[model samples]
Target: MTEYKLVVVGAVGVGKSALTIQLIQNHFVDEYDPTIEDSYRKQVVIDGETCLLDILDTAGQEEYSAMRDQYMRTGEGFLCVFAINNTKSFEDIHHYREQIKRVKDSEDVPMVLVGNKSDLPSRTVDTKQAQDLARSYGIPFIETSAKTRQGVDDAFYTLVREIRKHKE
Candidate 1:
């Protein structure tokens, strides 16, 4: 069994934990407490392949910046998620990408840019912009909804496929 370290990163309230739970356990927490600190780690098997996911659900507060880098350093793949309805979250993608590169130092790492909360029709970020950003970074991009389980598995599966292909 090949092991993979996947990381989910974004500003707080961008549905990092929600997406993680939805993809790994098929569950969602509606009323989540933002004050919860610390990252969640878990191992999930997809298509008979086991991959270890160290989901770093970092706080939106700036003080946790150091700890976020620690998590990024250990990731073999990355899922940079931002809420579709929040423009600020969407704008933070540059910072997220810079941090990932700063820690990983390899552009070859597979990354999936996720525009989450697709169930909401009132989106602040344009799909074209997300695609353009992902293209610029040479990463796969997808919009997902944890509420409806739409593209939740596809996002992770796509990244896994990319990692496998790159390894070959």
Candidate 2:
């Protein structure tokens, strides 16, 4: 068995909280609730191996920005989530990736770019563009809709697979 710490980050209203709730509790929330900071424990299996996840969902509010780097340091892996309907949210992924690398001192850290709110408007970021950005950082990308429980499991599972590859 292996255990890994993971952090969820993105712009406000980007569905970070919703994805976290879907992962830990297996339910989707309909409304946006800002998180100050939240943590959860989840046990799952990937490639026939059982693993535990210590998940931290960090708030993206300007007030909490100072601690974002610190939050990035606590994770063995990261979920760089952005709302597909929000353009600016998708744009900040570069900064998030840079921060994580600087804090962890590794450009090859386990990371995933998640475009959440798949059921919402698609005027902002699309799948191909998001995946392209992730590929620019050499990370996998996933799209998730917390309300419909779409791709939620795949996002975490994919990140865990990435983590395992790093360990091996």
Candidate 3:
């Protein structure tokens, strides 16, 4: 079976853990609890082939900055998450993308640009703007809400597909 090491990175309150948990646990977490580090595993069939997903929900705090590079180096794919309502969170995605590229030592590392909290009515980051950024980066962009479970699977599944394409 194929294994993909997927790392989720974003600024605080971007729903990194929520997205990961929603995918693995099949539910949403409403409360805000800052995550230091969390790992989850799930086996699924993607493209008719069995694959194992090793998902890492990373710490968003400044104190955990020291640990970022290590996971970036080891991660096979990444989900650079940002909150649709938070402009700063959207801006932080660029930093995460750069760091991941630098740590992986490759500009073409498998990644998915995710805009989370789509359930919220007010949005600071427009879909067209995010699509333009994703187009520039040459990566798939998806808007998701962990609460409603919309596009949650698509975000993770797309990353796995990107990883597959990267490998071949």
Candidate 4:
């Protein structure tokens, strides 16, 4: 089976857990009792092939920031998520990318810059801005809404495809 290890990193309340949970649970909850998924895994069939996915979601603690290097080191690819309504989250995308590049000592790492919470009514960050940033890094940028389930499959499968393509 094809295998991948992915890390989900984002600012607090940026929907990292919700997106992962939605992806895993396949539903959105109005009142969710959040669960731990620091190191989570599942098997999925994508592109008509059996694949195993190992996912790691951060706990959003500055105190635990020191351990991010270890988090940065373990993953084969990353899903850098940000809430579209919150521009501050968008600003930190670089730091996460740079951290990965620094840890891996490679600029060609597999990553997807995700603008999440697209179903929200107000968006401070425009798509053009996200496009420009993704273009600069020569990577894919996608918007996902765990609420509306818009682009959810695209957000994940595209990243998985990119990871596989980069592996060769």
Candidate 5:
């Protein structure tokens, strides 16, 4: 079976854990640690093939930031998640991408740009902006809501597909 090691990175309170729990647990509303990151494994069938998703969800504390490079290095793909209602999270996306690229030492690393919390009533980041960013990076961008389970699977599955495509 194929395995996809996906690392989730974003600014604090961007629903990174929520999206992860939603994908693995099939529901949201879970508590996590600020000083410690979480890792999970799930067996799934994508494209009619069995695959294992090894997910690493990063913490949201500056004190824990130093360990990010280790996670980035081990990750085969990344999900750059940002809350649509928070522009700061959107602004922070580049740092995570740049860090990943630096740690992985490749500009062509597999990644997906994700805008979470799409169910929020007000959004500071426009869909057009996200689309343009993804376009420029030559990656896929998708809006998702962990609460509503919208685009959650698509985000992870798409990243897996990207990793598979990059293998060539």
Candidate 6:
């Protein structure tokens, strides 16, 4: 099986852990501590190809911001997540993109901009704005709801497909 290093990033309470857990175990974790940084390994088969994935679920704390570069180095691709219900989380996506670029120094790395918490009706950020931001960075964008499993797998699988296409 092929191995890929995948990183999930966002500000606190943006559903990064929830998305990671959902993709790995097909379940959602509702009440997780934001203070904890976690990582996990899992394997998935896409289009009859098996791939081992090392998923790094980084802490959303600002104190651990320095480690973002380290994670970027090991990551083959990234899922930049933000909560649609929180304006601050939405604003932080740009910082996340800048951090990834600084660490990898490669503009071509496959990245998917994910707006989480789509099930929430009181969203502060509009989907169109998120798409515009992603377009400015030349990255693909999608809205996902971990609670409803909406667009969750598509975000990950789309990045994998992009990676494979780049290799070919």
Indicate which candidate wins on TM-score: 3
Instruction: Extract clashing residue pairs from model 2.
Output: none
- Tens-digit lDDT track for model 3 on 123-144? 7889998999889888878877
RMSD of each: 2.4, 1.9, 1.6, 2.0, 1.9, 1.8
How displaced is residue 39 in candidate 1, in Å?
A: 5.3
lDDT of 2 by residue, 1-168 (tens): 567887777787776667667767777777878787888877877667778888787667888556754655566777777777788888887776666667777657777777667787666666789878877988777777778887877776787778878899
Query: For model 2, what is the C-alpha lDDT against the true structure?
Result: 0.74
For model 5, how does the per-residue alpha-carbon lDDT over 66-87 read when each residue is reduced to its tens digit? 5655555666777777778788
After the best TM-score superposition of candidate 2, give how far the Cα of residue 6 lies from its true spot, in angstroms. Answer: 0.4
lDDT score of residue 107 within candidate 3: 62
Tens-digit lDDT track of model 4 for 12-73: 67646677667687867655433334776788777778798888877654565556555566
Better of 1 and 2 by lDDT: 2
Those runs of model 4 whose alpha carbons end farther than 4 Å from true positions after fitting are 30-37
Compute the lDDT of residue 21 as modeled in candidate 3.
67
Off-target runs (Cα >4 Å) in candidate 1 are 35-52
Residue 165 displacement (Å), model 1 = 2.1
Give each model's whole-structure lDDT.
Answer: 0.72, 0.74, 0.75, 0.75, 0.74, 0.76
Question: How much is 94 displaced in model 3, in angstroms?
Answer: 2.0
Tens-digit lDDT string for candidate 6 (94-158) = 76667667777776877778777888887788889988888898887877788988886677678
**Count of backbone collisions within predicted model 4:** 0
What is the alpha-carbon lDDT of model 5 when measured against the actual structure? 0.74
TM-score of candidate 2 to 2 decimals? 0.88
TM-score of each: 0.83, 0.88, 0.91, 0.89, 0.89, 0.90
